Amino acid sequence: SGMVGGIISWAITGGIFGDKAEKARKQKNKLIDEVKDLQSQVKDKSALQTSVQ
Amino acid sequence: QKTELQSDIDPKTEKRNKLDADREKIIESQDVIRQNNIADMFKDFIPSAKDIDGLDFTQPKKEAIKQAIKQGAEIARKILGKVSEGLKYIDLADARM
Amino acid sequence: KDIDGLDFTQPKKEAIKQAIKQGAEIARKILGKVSEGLKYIDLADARMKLSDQIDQLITETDELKAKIREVELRLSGLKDVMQIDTERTTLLTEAV
């Protein structure tokens, strides 16, 4: 938002939202790695259900 | 004991199903704030469709320093209005979070 | 409005800022077409993901539809064995 006229406000909203952009991206880092791990359980259990049957 | 716990499945299947709509009501209200983009916001910071009018009504103020304050007025407004719209989006997301 | 861009700005021919008035709306409309296409970016990437869902689903069906092939290939083979006992009775009760 800031630097259109507000060079001072660049650090303001970047301090406010750039944290929350970074935090949501870290949630985006964490959950994609979990879904990739949760998909890997489904892949083995699908191969498991074939193996048992 | 089997009938004890399936009678506890029924609140948890409903309470999950209650929060499914209450999640999506936040999502529908986040879509209003979603609706303008990065550069729609940057399109608003230029006072164009009034920026010629920003220099039409301020033709004798070229000797005045305060013409730039008239320029600086509405940009100082609209920088704040987009903050609060996103600041609504902060409290809107943290509920959903 | 470009004739009107020079109709309303006739005394500004001495002014350099007439070109800024010219430069104003073009700097607007270059951004408005970006965001319309930037909507189209997020709109396509949903569909790009949404097509890949169906790509898995068609793959997961025929892999599973290959499974009912083997079951039906087995079950028809087993019902063939079940008919053997029916004709084993007609063989033997005659031969008894």
PDB file of C-alpha atoms in Angstrom:
ATOM      1  CA  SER A   1       0.000   0.000   0.000  1.00  0.00           C
ATOM      2  CA  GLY A   2       2.562   2.462   1.281  1.00  0.00           C
ATOM      3  CA  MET A   3       4.927   4.110  -1.187  1.00  0.00           C
ATOM      4  CA  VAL A   4       2.359   5.830  -3.460  1.00  0.00           C
ATOM      5  CA  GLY A   5       2.711   8.893  -1.248  1.00  0.00           C
ATOM      6  CA  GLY A   6       3.295   7.292   2.131  1.00  0.00           C
ATOM      7  CA  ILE A   7       6.952   6.247   2.393  1.00  0.00           C
ATOM      8  CA  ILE A   8       6.382   6.401   6.156  1.00  0.00           C
ATOM      9  CA  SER A   9       3.236   4.294   5.731  1.00  0.00           C
ATOM     10  CA  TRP A  10       5.214   1.693   3.767  1.00  0.00           C
ATOM     11  CA  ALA A  11       6.694   0.464   7.028  1.00  0.00           C
ATOM     12  CA  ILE A  12       3.298   0.819   8.711  1.00  0.00           C
ATOM     13  CA  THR A  13       1.127  -1.492   6.620  1.00  0.00           C
ATOM     14  CA  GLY A  14       4.121  -3.618   5.700  1.00  0.00           C
ATOM     15  CA  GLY A  15       4.633  -4.042   9.419  1.00  0.00           C
ATOM     16  CA  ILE A  16       0.961  -4.897   9.856  1.00  0.00           C
ATOM     17  CA  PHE A  17       0.179  -7.005   6.812  1.00  0.00           C
ATOM     18  CA  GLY A  18       3.624  -8.220   5.757  1.00  0.00           C
ATOM     19  CA  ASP A  19       3.782 -10.180   8.982  1.00  0.00           C
ATOM     20  CA  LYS A  20       0.368 -11.675   8.281  1.00  0.00           C
ATOM     21  CA  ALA A  21       1.356 -12.330   4.685  1.00  0.00           C
ATOM     22  CA  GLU A  22       4.422 -14.135   6.005  1.00  0.00           C
ATOM     23  CA  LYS A  23       2.461 -16.019   8.669  1.00  0.00           C
ATOM     24  CA  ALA A  24      -0.201 -17.215   6.232  1.00  0.00           C
ATOM     25  CA  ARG A  25       2.564 -18.266   3.852  1.00  0.00           C
ATOM     26  CA  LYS A  26       4.139 -20.277   6.675  1.00  0.00           C
ATOM     27  CA  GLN A  27       0.755 -21.914   7.147  1.00  0.00           C
ATOM     28  CA  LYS A  28       0.843 -22.481   3.394  1.00  0.00           C
ATOM     29  CA  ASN A  29       4.300 -24.004   3.845  1.00  0.00           C
ATOM     30  CA  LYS A  30       3.129 -26.277   6.643  1.00  0.00           C
ATOM     31  CA  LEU A  31      -0.193 -27.566   5.338  1.00  0.00           C
ATOM     32  CA  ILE A  32       0.986 -28.461   1.821  1.00  0.00           C
ATOM     33  CA  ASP A  33       3.749 -30.512   3.424  1.00  0.00           C
ATOM     34  CA  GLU A  34       1.135 -32.186   5.615  1.00  0.00           C
ATOM     35  CA  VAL A  35      -1.229 -32.932   2.714  1.00  0.00           C
ATOM     36  CA  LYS A  36       1.758 -34.347   0.825  1.00  0.00           C
ATOM     37  CA  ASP A  37       2.347 -36.542   3.868  1.00  0.00           C
ATOM     38  CA  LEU A  38      -1.345 -37.376   4.252  1.00  0.00           C
ATOM     39  CA  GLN A  39      -1.583 -38.312   0.574  1.00  0.00           C
ATOM     40  CA  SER A  40       1.384 -40.636   1.104  1.00  0.00           C
ATOM     41  CA  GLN A  41      -0.554 -42.509   3.775  1.00  0.00           C
ATOM     42  CA  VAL A  42      -3.468 -42.936   1.364  1.00  0.00           C
ATOM     43  CA  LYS A  43      -1.110 -44.239  -1.324  1.00  0.00           C
ATOM     44  CA  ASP A  44       0.287 -46.915   0.975  1.00  0.00           C
ATOM     45  CA  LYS A  45      -3.090 -47.869   2.423  1.00  0.00           C
ATOM     46  CA  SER A  46      -4.547 -48.164  -1.072  1.00  0.00           C
ATOM     47  CA  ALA A  47      -1.629 -50.447  -1.860  1.00  0.00           C
ATOM     48  CA  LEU A  48      -2.294 -52.110   1.491  1.00  0.00           C
ATOM     49  CA  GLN A  49      -5.956 -52.836   0.755  1.00  0.00           C
ATOM     50  CA  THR A  50      -4.932 -54.365  -2.562  1.00  0.00           C
ATOM     51  CA  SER A  51      -2.249 -56.377  -0.761  1.00  0.00           C
ATOM     52  CA  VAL A  52      -4.638 -57.791   1.837  1.00  0.00           C
ATOM     53  CA  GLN A  53      -7.461 -58.605  -0.582  1.00  0.00           C
TER      54      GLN A  53
ATOM     55  CA  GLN B   1     -21.150 -48.937  25.573  1.00  0.00           C
ATOM     56  CA  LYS B   2     -21.613 -49.309  21.821  1.00  0.00           C
ATOM     57  CA  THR B   3     -24.824 -47.287  22.077  1.00  0.00           C
ATOM     58  CA  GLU B   4     -23.076 -44.811  24.392  1.00  0.00           C
ATOM     59  CA  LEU B   5     -20.640 -43.634  21.764  1.00  0.00           C
ATOM     60  CA  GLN B   6     -22.765 -43.618  18.616  1.00  0.00           C
ATOM     61  CA  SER B   7     -24.994 -41.307  20.643  1.00  0.00           C
ATOM     62  CA  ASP B   8     -21.871 -39.125  20.885  1.00  0.00           C
ATOM     63  CA  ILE B   9     -21.180 -39.383  17.154  1.00  0.00           C
ATOM     64  CA  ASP B  10     -24.477 -37.597  16.481  1.00  0.00           C
ATOM     65  CA  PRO B  11     -23.540 -34.310  18.250  1.00  0.00           C
ATOM     66  CA  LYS B  12     -20.091 -34.303  16.667  1.00  0.00           C
ATOM     67  CA  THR B  13     -21.442 -34.983  13.187  1.00  0.00           C
ATOM     68  CA  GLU B  14     -23.912 -32.137  13.671  1.00  0.00           C
ATOM     69  CA  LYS B  15     -21.500 -29.712  15.354  1.00  0.00           C
ATOM     70  CA  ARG B  16     -19.076 -30.271  12.488  1.00  0.00           C
ATOM     71  CA  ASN B  17     -21.942 -29.723  10.065  1.00  0.00           C
ATOM     72  CA  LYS B  18     -22.960 -26.545  11.899  1.00  0.00           C
ATOM     73  CA  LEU B  19     -19.487 -25.038  11.532  1.00  0.00           C
ATOM     74  CA  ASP B  20     -19.349 -25.909   7.827  1.00  0.00           C
ATOM     75  CA  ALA B  21     -21.831 -23.152   7.026  1.00  0.00           C
ATOM     76  CA  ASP B  22     -20.323 -20.752   9.564  1.00  0.00           C
ATOM     77  CA  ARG B  23     -16.964 -21.246   7.893  1.00  0.00           C
ATOM     78  CA  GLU B  24     -18.418 -20.517   4.466  1.00  0.00           C
ATOM     79  CA  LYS B  25     -20.311 -17.427   5.629  1.00  0.00           C
ATOM     80  CA  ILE B  26     -16.909 -15.976   6.488  1.00  0.00           C
ATOM     81  CA  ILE B  27     -15.650 -17.100   3.066  1.00  0.00           C
ATOM     82  CA  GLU B  28     -18.523 -15.302   1.329  1.00  0.00           C
ATOM     83  CA  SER B  29     -17.695 -12.170   3.295  1.00  0.00           C
ATOM     84  CA  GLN B  30     -14.015 -12.606   2.465  1.00  0.00           C
ATOM     85  CA  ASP B  31     -14.926 -12.743  -1.231  1.00  0.00           C
ATOM     86  CA  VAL B  32     -16.159  -9.145  -1.112  1.00  0.00           C
ATOM     87  CA  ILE B  33     -12.746  -8.012   0.097  1.00  0.00           C
ATOM     88  CA  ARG B  34     -11.150 -10.458  -2.363  1.00  0.00           C
ATOM     89  CA  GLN B  35     -12.998  -8.864  -5.268  1.00  0.00           C
ATOM     90  CA  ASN B  36     -10.483  -6.086  -5.921  1.00  0.00           C
ATOM     91  CA  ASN B  37      -6.960  -7.074  -6.858  1.00  0.00           C
ATOM     92  CA  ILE B  38      -3.443  -5.845  -6.177  1.00  0.00           C
ATOM     93  CA  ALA B  39      -3.489  -3.354  -9.027  1.00  0.00           C
ATOM     94  CA  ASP B  40      -7.157  -2.400  -8.705  1.00  0.00           C
ATOM     95  CA  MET B  41      -5.921  -0.956  -5.430  1.00  0.00           C
ATOM     96  CA  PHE B  42      -3.016   0.669  -7.295  1.00  0.00           C
ATOM     97  CA  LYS B  43      -5.535   1.923  -9.861  1.00  0.00           C
ATOM     98  CA  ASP B  44      -7.362   3.645  -7.019  1.00  0.00           C
ATOM     99  CA  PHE B  45      -4.241   5.374  -5.664  1.00  0.00           C
ATOM    100  CA  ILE B  46      -3.888   7.330  -8.874  1.00  0.00           C
ATOM    101  CA  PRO B  47      -6.679   9.943  -8.703  1.00  0.00           C
ATOM    102  CA  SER B  48      -7.335   9.427 -12.443  1.00  0.00           C
ATOM    103  CA  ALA B  49     -10.848  10.243 -13.740  1.00  0.00           C
ATOM    104  CA  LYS B  50     -10.354  13.157 -11.327  1.00  0.00           C
ATOM    105  CA  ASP B  51      -6.600  13.768 -11.705  1.00  0.00           C
ATOM    106  CA  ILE B  52      -7.067  16.002 -14.725  1.00  0.00           C
ATOM    107  CA  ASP B  53      -9.842  17.466 -12.575  1.00  0.00           C
ATOM    108  CA  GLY B  54      -7.216  17.575  -9.829  1.00  0.00           C
ATOM    109  CA  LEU B  55      -5.400  19.996 -12.123  1.00  0.00           C
ATOM    110  CA  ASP B  56      -8.522  21.485 -13.730  1.00  0.00           C
ATOM    111  CA  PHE B  57      -9.922  22.983 -10.519  1.00  0.00           C
ATOM    112  CA  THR B  58      -6.397  23.873  -9.308  1.00  0.00           C
ATOM    113  CA  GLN B  59      -5.101  25.898 -12.262  1.00  0.00           C
ATOM    114  CA  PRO B  60      -4.389  29.191 -10.371  1.00  0.00           C
ATOM    115  CA  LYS B  61      -2.848  27.214  -7.474  1.00  0.00           C
ATOM    116  CA  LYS B  62       0.370  26.528  -9.418  1.00  0.00           C
ATOM    117  CA  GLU B  63       1.904  29.334  -7.369  1.00  0.00           C
ATOM    118  CA  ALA B  64       0.413  27.682  -4.276  1.00  0.00           C
ATOM    119  CA  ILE B  65       2.329  24.946  -2.479  1.00  0.00           C
ATOM    120  CA  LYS B  66      -1.049  23.811  -1.070  1.00  0.00           C
ATOM    121  CA  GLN B  67      -2.132  22.472  -4.486  1.00  0.00           C
ATOM    122  CA  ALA B  68       0.002  19.429  -3.665  1.00  0.00           C
ATOM    123  CA  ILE B  69      -1.804  19.214  -0.322  1.00  0.00           C
ATOM    124  CA  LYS B  70      -5.051  19.088  -2.309  1.00  0.00           C
ATOM    125  CA  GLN B  71      -3.288  16.373  -4.285  1.00  0.00           C
ATOM    126  CA  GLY B  72      -2.055  14.906  -0.998  1.00  0.00           C
ATOM    127  CA  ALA B  73      -5.520  15.000   0.571  1.00  0.00           C
ATOM    128  CA  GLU B  74      -7.414  12.240  -1.220  1.00  0.00           C
ATOM    129  CA  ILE B  75      -4.424   9.907  -1.441  1.00  0.00           C
ATOM    130  CA  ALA B  76      -4.091  10.220   2.337  1.00  0.00           C
ATOM    131  CA  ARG B  77      -7.769   9.293   2.575  1.00  0.00           C
ATOM    132  CA  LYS B  78      -7.817   6.292   0.282  1.00  0.00           C
ATOM    133  CA  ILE B  79      -4.652   4.784   1.744  1.00  0.00           C
ATOM    134  CA  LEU B  80      -6.549   4.507   5.040  1.00  0.00           C
ATOM    135  CA  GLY B  81      -9.806   3.187   3.591  1.00  0.00           C
ATOM    136  CA  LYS B  82      -8.014   0.225   2.074  1.00  0.00           C
ATOM    137  CA  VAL B  83      -6.290  -0.457   5.412  1.00  0.00           C
ATOM    138  CA  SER B  84      -9.570  -0.731   7.315  1.00  0.00           C
ATOM    139  CA  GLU B  85     -11.130  -2.890   4.613  1.00  0.00           C
ATOM    140  CA  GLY B  86      -8.189  -5.218   5.040  1.00  0.00           C
ATOM    141  CA  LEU B  87      -8.324  -4.718   8.779  1.00  0.00           C
ATOM    142  CA  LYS B  88     -11.863  -6.074   8.641  1.00  0.00           C
ATOM    143  CA  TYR B  89     -10.321  -8.945   6.672  1.00  0.00           C
ATOM    144  CA  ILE B  90      -7.888  -9.514   9.553  1.00  0.00           C
ATOM    145  CA  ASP B  91     -10.623 -10.029  12.147  1.00  0.00           C
ATOM    146  CA  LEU B  92     -12.680 -11.887   9.564  1.00  0.00           C
ATOM    147  CA  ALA B  93      -9.888 -14.381   8.903  1.00  0.00           C
ATOM    148  CA  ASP B  94      -8.888 -14.832  12.545  1.00  0.00           C
ATOM    149  CA  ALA B  95     -12.430 -15.903  13.317  1.00  0.00           C
ATOM    150  CA  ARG B  96     -12.221 -18.427  10.465  1.00  0.00           C
ATOM    151  CA  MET B  97      -8.702 -19.402  11.521  1.00  0.00           C
TER     152      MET B  97
ATOM    153  CA  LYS C   1     -12.338  11.780 -25.552  1.00  0.00           C
ATOM    154  CA  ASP C   2      -8.956  12.397 -27.222  1.00  0.00           C
ATOM    155  CA  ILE C   3     -10.244  15.374 -29.176  1.00  0.00           C
ATOM    156  CA  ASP C   4     -11.802  16.255 -25.821  1.00  0.00           C
ATOM    157  CA  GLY C   5      -8.345  15.566 -24.398  1.00  0.00           C
ATOM    158  CA  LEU C   6      -7.238  18.482 -26.565  1.00  0.00           C
ATOM    159  CA  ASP C   7     -10.525  20.410 -26.396  1.00  0.00           C
ATOM    160  CA  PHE C   8     -10.418  21.010 -22.637  1.00  0.00           C
ATOM    161  CA  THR C   9      -6.616  21.471 -22.741  1.00  0.00           C
ATOM    162  CA  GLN C  10      -6.282  24.195 -25.382  1.00  0.00           C
ATOM    163  CA  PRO C  11      -4.510  26.839 -23.194  1.00  0.00           C
ATOM    164  CA  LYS C  12      -2.252  24.122 -21.712  1.00  0.00           C
ATOM    165  CA  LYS C  13      -0.111  23.925 -24.872  1.00  0.00           C
ATOM    166  CA  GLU C  14       2.413  26.042 -22.985  1.00  0.00           C
ATOM    167  CA  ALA C  15       2.002  23.644 -20.053  1.00  0.00           C
ATOM    168  CA  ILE C  16       4.098  20.487 -19.878  1.00  0.00           C
ATOM    169  CA  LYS C  17       1.382  19.079 -17.568  1.00  0.00           C
ATOM    170  CA  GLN C  18      -1.061  18.735 -20.489  1.00  0.00           C
ATOM    171  CA  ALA C  19       0.831  15.543 -21.339  1.00  0.00           C
ATOM    172  CA  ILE C  20       0.401  14.466 -17.715  1.00  0.00           C
ATOM    173  CA  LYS C  21      -3.344  14.946 -18.224  1.00  0.00           C
ATOM    174  CA  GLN C  22      -2.803  12.832 -21.327  1.00  0.00           C
ATOM    175  CA  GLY C  23      -0.619  10.507 -19.255  1.00  0.00           C
ATOM    176  CA  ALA C  24      -3.200  10.242 -16.472  1.00  0.00           C
ATOM    177  CA  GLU C  25      -5.955   8.105 -17.976  1.00  0.00           C
ATOM    178  CA  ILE C  26      -3.582   5.862 -19.916  1.00  0.00           C
ATOM    179  CA  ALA C  27      -1.817   5.134 -16.623  1.00  0.00           C
ATOM    180  CA  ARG C  28      -5.220   4.249 -15.184  1.00  0.00           C
ATOM    181  CA  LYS C  29      -6.498   1.982 -17.921  1.00  0.00           C
ATOM    182  CA  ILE C  30      -3.229   0.073 -18.239  1.00  0.00           C
ATOM    183  CA  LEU C  31      -3.768  -1.047 -14.635  1.00  0.00           C
ATOM    184  CA  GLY C  32      -7.467  -1.862 -14.950  1.00  0.00           C
ATOM    185  CA  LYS C  33      -6.759  -4.339 -17.718  1.00  0.00           C
ATOM    186  CA  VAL C  34      -4.006  -5.932 -15.605  1.00  0.00           C
ATOM    187  CA  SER C  35      -6.336  -6.646 -12.687  1.00  0.00           C
ATOM    188  CA  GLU C  36      -9.054  -7.964 -14.987  1.00  0.00           C
ATOM    189  CA  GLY C  37      -6.480 -10.377 -16.332  1.00  0.00           C
ATOM    190  CA  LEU C  38      -5.138 -10.905 -12.844  1.00  0.00           C
ATOM    191  CA  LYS C  39      -8.609 -12.103 -11.895  1.00  0.00           C
ATOM    192  CA  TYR C  40      -8.289 -14.364 -14.942  1.00  0.00           C
ATOM    193  CA  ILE C  41      -5.042 -15.738 -13.488  1.00  0.00           C
ATOM    194  CA  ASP C  42      -6.643 -16.883 -10.232  1.00  0.00           C
ATOM    195  CA  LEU C  43      -9.733 -17.933 -12.157  1.00  0.00           C
ATOM    196  CA  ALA C  44      -7.727 -20.208 -14.447  1.00  0.00           C
ATOM    197  CA  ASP C  45      -5.497 -21.647 -11.723  1.00  0.00           C
ATOM    198  CA  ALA C  46      -8.593 -22.818  -9.897  1.00  0.00           C
ATOM    199  CA  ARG C  47      -9.785 -24.480 -13.117  1.00  0.00           C
ATOM    200  CA  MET C  48      -6.277 -25.772 -13.807  1.00  0.00           C
ATOM    201  CA  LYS C  49      -6.483 -27.407 -10.392  1.00  0.00           C
ATOM    202  CA  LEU C  50     -10.129 -28.337 -10.933  1.00  0.00           C
ATOM    203  CA  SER C  51      -9.335 -30.120 -14.189  1.00  0.00           C
ATOM    204  CA  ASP C  52      -6.603 -32.104 -12.424  1.00  0.00           C
ATOM    205  CA  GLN C  53      -9.184 -33.350  -9.932  1.00  0.00           C
ATOM    206  CA  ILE C  54     -11.155 -34.921 -12.776  1.00  0.00           C
ATOM    207  CA  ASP C  55      -7.896 -36.247 -14.245  1.00  0.00           C
ATOM    208  CA  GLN C  56      -7.316 -38.188 -11.042  1.00  0.00           C
ATOM    209  CA  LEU C  57     -10.985 -39.209 -10.883  1.00  0.00           C
ATOM    210  CA  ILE C  58     -11.013 -40.682 -14.392  1.00  0.00           C
ATOM    211  CA  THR C  59      -7.747 -42.437 -13.539  1.00  0.00           C
ATOM    212  CA  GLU C  60      -9.106 -43.718 -10.226  1.00  0.00           C
ATOM    213  CA  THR C  61     -12.281 -45.046 -11.868  1.00  0.00           C
ATOM    214  CA  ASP C  62     -10.673 -47.151 -14.582  1.00  0.00           C
ATOM    215  CA  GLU C  63      -8.081 -48.480 -12.161  1.00  0.00           C
ATOM    216  CA  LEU C  64     -11.015 -49.498  -9.987  1.00  0.00           C
ATOM    217  CA  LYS C  65     -12.978 -50.566 -13.066  1.00  0.00           C
ATOM    218  CA  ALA C  66     -10.026 -52.820 -13.816  1.00  0.00           C
ATOM    219  CA  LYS C  67     -10.638 -54.402 -10.411  1.00  0.00           C
ATOM    220  CA  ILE C  68     -14.227 -55.445 -11.141  1.00  0.00           C
ATOM    221  CA  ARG C  69     -12.894 -56.997 -14.337  1.00  0.00           C
ATOM    222  CA  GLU C  70     -10.749 -59.419 -12.339  1.00  0.00           C
ATOM    223  CA  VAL C  71     -13.568 -60.132  -9.894  1.00  0.00           C
ATOM    224  CA  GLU C  72     -16.013 -60.859 -12.716  1.00  0.00           C
ATOM    225  CA  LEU C  73     -13.304 -62.898 -14.441  1.00  0.00           C
ATOM    226  CA  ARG C  74     -12.986 -64.843 -11.203  1.00  0.00           C
ATOM    227  CA  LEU C  75     -16.698 -65.090 -10.367  1.00  0.00           C
ATOM    228  CA  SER C  76     -17.598 -66.297 -13.853  1.00  0.00           C
ATOM    229  CA  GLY C  77     -14.818 -68.854 -13.519  1.00  0.00           C
ATOM    230  CA  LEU C  78     -16.204 -69.926 -10.159  1.00  0.00           C
ATOM    231  CA  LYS C  79     -19.778 -70.231 -11.415  1.00  0.00           C
ATOM    232  CA  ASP C  80     -18.351 -72.478 -14.120  1.00  0.00           C
ATOM    233  CA  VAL C  81     -17.103 -74.732 -11.330  1.00  0.00           C
ATOM    234  CA  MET C  82     -20.504 -74.499  -9.641  1.00  0.00           C
ATOM    235  CA  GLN C  83     -22.170 -75.839 -12.784  1.00  0.00           C
ATOM    236  CA  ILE C  84     -19.849 -78.866 -12.780  1.00  0.00           C
ATOM    237  CA  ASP C  85     -21.506 -80.286  -9.665  1.00  0.00           C
ATOM    238  CA  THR C  86     -24.935 -79.806 -11.248  1.00  0.00           C
ATOM    239  CA  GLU C  87     -23.948 -81.891 -14.255  1.00  0.00           C
ATOM    240  CA  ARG C  88     -21.977 -84.273 -12.056  1.00  0.00           C
ATOM    241  CA  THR C  89     -25.317 -85.243 -10.517  1.00  0.00           C
ATOM    242  CA  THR C  90     -26.938 -85.772 -13.921  1.00  0.00           C
ATOM    243  CA  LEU C  91     -23.906 -87.842 -14.898  1.00  0.00           C
ATOM    244  CA  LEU C  92     -23.884 -89.996 -11.800  1.00  0.00           C
ATOM    245  CA  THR C  93     -27.605 -90.476 -11.064  1.00  0.00           C
ATOM    246  CA  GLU C  94     -27.906 -91.777 -14.590  1.00  0.00           C
ATOM    247  CA  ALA C  95     -24.803 -93.946 -14.158  1.00  0.00           C
ATOM    248  CA  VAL C  96     -26.012 -95.201 -10.764  1.00  0.00           C
TER     249      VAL C  96
END
